[PDB]
Paper text:
[name] ([name], or amylin) is a 37-residue peptide hormone that is cosecreted with insulin and one of the most amyloid-prone sequences known. Overproduction and aggregation of [name] leads to amyloid deposition in the islets of Langerhans, a pathological hallmark of type-2 diabetes. Although the precise link between [name] aggregation and disease remains uncertain, [name] aggregates have been shown to be toxic in cell-based assays, and genetic and animal studies implicate islet amyloid in the progressive loss of pancreatic β-cell function. Over 40 different proteins, with diverse native structures or in many cases intrinsic disorder, form amyloid associated with human disease, yet all amyloid fibrils share a common cross-β architecture consisting of a continuous intermolecular β-sheet supported by networks of zipper and ladder-like interactions. Amyloid fibrils have a similar cross-β architecture, but fibrils formed by a single protein sequence can have diverse structures, varying with time, self-assembly conditions, and sequence modifications.
Cryo-EM was performed on fibrils assembled from 30 μM [name] in the same buffer used for kinetic assays (160 mM ammonium acetate, pH 7.4, 1% v/v DMSO), in the absence (4 replicates) or presence (2 replicates each) of 50 μM YX-I-1, canagliflozin, or doxazosin. Fibrils were imaged after 2 weeks, at which point fibril formation was at a steady state, as judged by analyzing aliquots with ThT. Following helical reconstruction, multiple distinct [name] fibril polymorphs were resolved, revealing further detail on the apparent morphological differences between the samples. Thus, out of the fibril structures that were identified in each data set, YX-I-1 fibrils consisted of 89% C-fold subunits, whereas this subunit fold was absent from fibrils grown in the control or with doxazosin. By contrast, the control and doxazosin-treated samples consisted of L-fold (62% or 72%, respectively), U-fold (34% or 28%), and S-fold (4% or 0%) subunits. Attempts to solve the structure(s) of these assemblies using the fibril structures identified here for wild-type [name] and previously for [name] S20G22 as starting templates were also unsuccessful. Together, the cryo-EM data analysis demonstrates that YX-I-1 and canagliflozin direct [name] assembly to amyloid architectures that are different from each other and those observed in the control or with doxazosin.
Residue numbers in the entry:
A (entry chain K), B (entry chain I), C (entry chain G), D (entry chain E), E (entry chain C), F (entry chain A), ...: 12 to 37
The structure:
């Protein structure tokens, strides 16, 4: 169980919240 | 169980919150 | 159980909060 | 149980808070 | 049980707070 | 039980606070 | 005379190219 | 005369190229 | 005359190339 | 005449290349 | 005439290449 | 004429290559 809370303002950069069970490339 | 709370403002850099069960490349 | 709290402002550098159960490359 | 609190401002360098149960490369 | 508190400003260098249960390479 | 408090400013060098239960390479 | 050439791909962080003749805040 | 060429890929951190004739705060 | 060439990949930290003729704060 | 070439990969720390003709604070 | 070439990988610490004609504080 | 070549890997400490024509404080 994963819980993500993201409160943001004036955001230019990328914000990434994720769960990668297996293989992933960014 | 993973809990992530991210409070941010005036953000330029990338903020990454994640869980990698297996293999991952950034 | 892992708990992450990140309060930030005026951030240029990358901020990474994560749990790597197995193999991971950054 | 791991608890991470990161309060930062004017940050250029990378800030990494993480738990590596097994093998990890940075 | 590990508790990490990092208060920083004007940071250029990398700040790493982590727990390595097993093998890890930086 | 390990407690880490790091108060820093104008930091260029890497600051590392960590607990290595087993094998670790830096 | 200022010349800026920015070739980028897969960009998450903010890329800023600018000329500040006088006072500026980021 | 200032010339800036920035070729980048897979960029997370902020990349700043700029000329500050007078006073500037980052 | 200042010439800047920056070739980068997999960049998390801030990369700053700049010319400060007068007073500047980072 | 100043020439800067910066080739980098897997960079967390801040990399600064600059020319300060007069007064500067970091 | 100053020439700077910086080839780096896996960098956490700040790398600074600069020319200070007059007064400078780091 | 000053030439600087810095090849580094796995660097935590600050590496500074610079030319100070006049007064400088670190």
């Amino acid at each position: 169980l994963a819980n993500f809370l993201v409160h943001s303002s004036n955001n230019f950069g990328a914000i990434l919240s994720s769960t990668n069970v297996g293989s992933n490339t960014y």
